[PDB]
Ligand binder design. Structure first.
Ligand SMILES: C[C@@H]1O[C@@H](O)[C@@H](O)[C@H](O)[C@@H]1O
Ligand SMILES: C[C@@H]1O[C@@H](O)[C@@H](O)[C@H](O)[C@@H]1O
Lengths: 410, 409
C-alpha cells in the first residue's frame, strides 16, 4: 500500500474541475464529433477557421466563473479530434488560432487567467486526429507531430497543472510510444498531472490519474499494491454532448449534477463538470444556470468537498447516505430529505427521520447541518459502532439535494 | 357532452405560464414564508415599503411566454399573504397603489398579453392571511373576496379567465359560489373559471378543474348529461412556487418536456410555473428552462394545440402515445437515443420497432417533425396494428419526446 506522490495528493484535494469543450465544431452547435459523424466535406468544414474570431472568449470571465462554482482546476480542449489547435503551434501547423482571425494564443490567455484565480490549468489533447494525413498515411511521423504539439504546451506557458489525454477511438494495438511522450512531459513539467482516459495494469508508469465512468458504484482502483498510487476522475456533461449542441434538450437535472459531485467524492475520485462554449467562446446561458446552482451547493459543502475522503463507514439498509472523513471531522452526506411544512401543511420532512451509520467508534460531542448550523439529536452504540441521527428535513424555502452534517468528536 | 365553445378554445391553448410574484418574493424563501416560518405579520408586511417593481416588465414577460409557445399566462393577483398587485380602488390599503411601485401591475399585464395575443388569467387566493374578516366575519369576507374579483372583472377589459385557489379553507363553509361565479359571468361571459378544488363539481359555472401532474390516465370530464369540464396540470421547476434562492432541487428539462407531453396525452392543459424576483424579473434559471421548452414547443406546434387523446395504445414496455387532430395522427415517441456512425455507437442506430394498436386506416407516409425524415412502417389493418422503425436522433440533437406525423391515404 503506497501513498500518493505530493502532486497527486494535491490533485485529489482539487475535488472539482470544469471541463471546457471549444473548437471549430462550436460554430455548428451540433456536437463536437460533427465532422466525422455527419460525414462532412473536410475541406468545407476546415473553412470554419476563417470565422473563428473568438470574439466573445474572455479567459478572465471563465476563470472567475470556475472560481465561483468552487472548481479548483479547468481542463480546456487545446486540440480535439477535428485537429485544430487553440494555441500558437510555432510552425508545427497552419491549422491553429494564429492563422485564424482571432490571432490570439488562447491557451496563453487561459493560463494567465487560471493563475490569477489560483486555478490549475489543464490541457486536453486528442490523440485521434482527423486533420493531419500523417495519422493514417505515416503513423510514426504522426507520433512525432503529436509529441511536438505537446512539447509546445510544455515549454511555452510556464508550469502547467496537467494534461488530459484522450486516447479513445484509436488504432488497436498500435505502439503509441507512451514512454517517450510522457518522459518528455516529465522532463519539462516534472510537477504536471498526467490524466489518461485509457489509463487502464496502467498503460504507463507516468500516468497519475485514470478516468472512470460516473456510474461506478464503489471506491475506485488505485493501482497494484506496492506500486505507484494512481488517482481517479469522473466526468459529467450537462446534456448528451460535450461540445455545444443547440437542439439537445435532454439536460440532466441540477439535482442529479449535485448527486454526481457528491458521488465522486464518496468513491474517492475527482469530478469534472463539462460546459461547451458557443462558436465565439462565450459560456452559454444554460451552462451559467447549472454553474450558479452548483456553486451554491459547493460553497455550502466547502468544509468537506476538497479534503473529505472515503472511510469504512456504511449507512443503514435502504438509504443512500455516506460519510466523508477529514483529519478533524467526519461528515454525514444525507440524501432523500424533504422540506418541512407547518401544522396542517405537510411537505414530507416533518417526522423524526432516524438515519444510521455503522463504523463510527468514537464518542460524539455535537452534530450539526452545514447549511444552517442546526444541532441534530443522535444516539450511539460504541461497541457495535452504530450512530443514529434524527436527520431533520429542509427549512421551507430551501432544498440542498445532498445535505451535509458535520460531526464534532469529544 | 362536448365542451362549450369557450372550453374548446381553452383546450386549444395547450400550454400556459404560471407566474408567482408577491411580497414573499423579496425574501426568496418560498411564497408560504409568512405562515410557515411563523413571521410577525407587522414585520413581514413592511415588505410593501420596498415593493418597487423596479424590474417588472410585462412586455418582457409576455414576449417570453410567446417564445415558449404558451398561449395564456396565470398571474398571482393576490396570494395567501393577501397583498394585491392591482388598484383595489379603496377596498384595501394593502395593494400596489400604496407601495413605491405606484403602478397597476395587472393593467400592464393585460395590455402586454393582448399585444402578444395571449389570454391573461388572474390567480386569486381565497384563503387570506391579511384581512381579519376571514376568521372574524366570514360573510363580510365573502363580500370582500367578491368585491376584489369584481374590480378584476370591470377594470381591465375582457379577461381570459380566473384561477381560484380554494385550498386550505374551512371545509364546511358556504362560499356562495353561485353568486361569485354568477357575477363573473355577467361581467365576463367568456372568462374561463378554473378551480383547484373544483371536485361532483363544486359549482355549475366551473369550466376547468386541476389535477396532479402524475395522473396516469385521461382525466375526468364531469358526469354524463352534465357540462363538460376541462383539466389542467401544473409544474414548478424546483420544489417552490415563489422564488426560493436555496432550493437547488430543480427537475430536469427532460422531465419538463415529458410533463408537457403527458398533459396532452391525458387531455389536460399544462401550466409551467416561474417565480419572479422581489423586483419582478424573470430569474436566469427560469429563462434557461423556457428556452429549452421553447425549442421543443416550436417543433411540436403542429400537434401541441389541437392534438387530443385517442383510443390508440402503445406496445408492451414503451411509454409512446398518440395524439389526434382532424387531419393527422401523431406518434409521440419516448426513450430514443442518439445515432452515432460506424464504430461510434451511441445507442440509437439499430432498427427500433415501436408498435401501436387502434389505427385502422391505411397510411401513406410517416415523418419526424424535427427533420422530416420518412419512417418505414407496416400495418395489420384487421388487428389495427401499426409498427414503425423509430430511428434515433441525428447526432447533435435530442428532443426527449420525438413526434412523428402520420399522413393517411
Ligand atoms: C471528454 C469526451 O470524451 C472523449 O472520448 C471524446 O471522444 C469526447 O468528444 C469528449 O471529449
Ligand atoms: C399553485 C399552488 O396553489 C396553491 O395550492 C398554493 O397553496 C400554492 O402556494 C401555489 O400557489
Amino acid at each position: 500500500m503506497t501513498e500518493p506522490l505530493p502532486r497527486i495528493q494535491h490533485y485529489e484535494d482539487l475535488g472539482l474541475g470544469l471541463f471546457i469543450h471549444w473548437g471549430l465544431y462550436s460554430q455548428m452547435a451540433v456536437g463536437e464529433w460533427t465532422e466525422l459523424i455527419h460525414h462532412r466535406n473536410q475541406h468545407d468544414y476546415e473553412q470554419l477557421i476563417k470565422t473563428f474570431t473568438a470574439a466573445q472568449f474572455d479567459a478572465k470571465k471563465i476563470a472567475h466563473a470556475a472560481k465561483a462554482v468552487g472548481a479548483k482546476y479547468i481542463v480546456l480542449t487545446t486540440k480535439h479530434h477535428e485537429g485544430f489547435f487553440l494555441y500558437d503551434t510555432k510552425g508545427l501547423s497552419d491549422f491553429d488560432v494564429m492563422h485564424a482571425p482571432a490571432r490570439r494564443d488562447l491557451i496563453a490567455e487561459f493560463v494567465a487567467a487560471c493563475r490569477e484565480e489560483d486555478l490549475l490549468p489543464f490541457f486536453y489533447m486528442a490523440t485521434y486526429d482527423w486533420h493531419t494525413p500523417l495519422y493514417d498515411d505515416d503513423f510514426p511521423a504522426y507520433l512525432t507531430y503529436l509529441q511536438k504539439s505537446v512539447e509546445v504546451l510544455c515549454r511555452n506557458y510556464g508550469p502547467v497543472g496537467g494534461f488530459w489525454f484522450d486516447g479513445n477511438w484509436n488504432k488497436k494495438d498500435a505502439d503509441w510510444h507512451l514512454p517517450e511522450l510522457y518522459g518528455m512531459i516529465r522532463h519539462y513539467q516534472p510537477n504536471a498531472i498526467i490524466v489518461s482516459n485509457t489509463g487502464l495494469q496502467v498503460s504507463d508508469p507516468e500516468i497519475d490519474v485514470v478516468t472512470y465512468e460516473r456510474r461506478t458504484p464503489d471506491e475506485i482502483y488505485h493501482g497494484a499494491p506496492n506500486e505507484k498510487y494512481v488517482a481517479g476522475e469522473i466526468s459529467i456533461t450537462l446534456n448528451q454532448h460535450w461540445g455545444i449542441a443547440a437542439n439537445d434538450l435532454n439536460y440532466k437535472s441540477p439535482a442529479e449534477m449535485i448527486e454526481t459531485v457528491a458521488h465522486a467524492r464518496h468513491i474517492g475520485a475527482n469530478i469534472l463538470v463539462n460546459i461547451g462554449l458557443t462558436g465565439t467562446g462565450a459560456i452559454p446561458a444554460a451552462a451559467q444556470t447549472y454553474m450558479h446552482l452548483l456553486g451554491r451547493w459547493t460553497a455550502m459543502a466547502a468544509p468537506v468537498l476538497y479534503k473529505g475522503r472515503p472511510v469504512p463507514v456504511t449507512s443503514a439498509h435502504g438509504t443512500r447516505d455516506f460519510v466523508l472523513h477529514t483529519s478533524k471531522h467526519d461528515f454525514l452526506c444525507i440524501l432523500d430529505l424533504q422540506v418541512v411544512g407547518k401544522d396542517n401543511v405537510v411537505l414530507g420532512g416533518e417526522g423524526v427521520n432516524p438515519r444510521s451509520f455503522v463504523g463510527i467508534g468514537q464518542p460524539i460531542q455535537r452534530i450539526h447541518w452545514l447549511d444552517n448550523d442546526e444541532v441534530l439529536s443522535f444516539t450511539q452504540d460504541l461497541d457495535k459502532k452504530v450512530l443514529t441521527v434524527d436527520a431533520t428535513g429542509y427549512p421551507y424555502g430551501s432544498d440542498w439535494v445532498v445535505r451535509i452534517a458535520q460531526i464534532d468528536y469529544e
